[PDB]
Amino acid sequence: GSMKKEELIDKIKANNRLLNAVVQEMYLDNSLDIKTRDYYASNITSVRQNGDQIIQILDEEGIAE
């Protein structure tokens, strides 16, 4: 079971904020610019890199769609 190019960014999208510890109140700002909350999401980066890292991994290797 491999994730599709559409599910690749979707999985990490929800897997990123999966932390919800420090920027759990900012990242949850669905009515805010992804970049806006992304900035404050620098402290919890420890959890962001986890997914953000795959974003490129699947981009370089390619996704099955």
Side-chain angles (χ1 to χ4, degrees):
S2 316
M3 313 303 111
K4 193 155 296 202
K5 163 266 156 73
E6 156 57 16
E7 211 290 306
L8 172 274
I9 57 168
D10 234 274
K11 221 300 191 86
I12 72 93
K13 150 269 235 59
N15 138 93
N16 265 218
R17 312 187 280 157
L18 213 60
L19 219 293
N20 296 131
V22 186
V23 303
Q24 83 260 255
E25 320 206 83
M26 172 62 66
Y27 238 148
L28 62 60
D29 204 310
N30 69 94
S31 208
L32 253 182
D33 227 308
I34 302 306
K35 314 304 178 76
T36 304
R37 53 233 259 204
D38 170 55
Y39 312 142
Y40 298 85
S42 198
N43 27 280
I44 88 304
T45 180
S46 199
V47 71
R48 233 205 326 100
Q49 270 148 127
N50 148 46
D52 195 356
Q53 179 138 14
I54 305 179
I55 287 176
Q56 53 177 116
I57 293 160
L58 258 90
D59 177 20
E60 57 180 14
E61 204 182 26
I63 330 90
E65 68 174 324

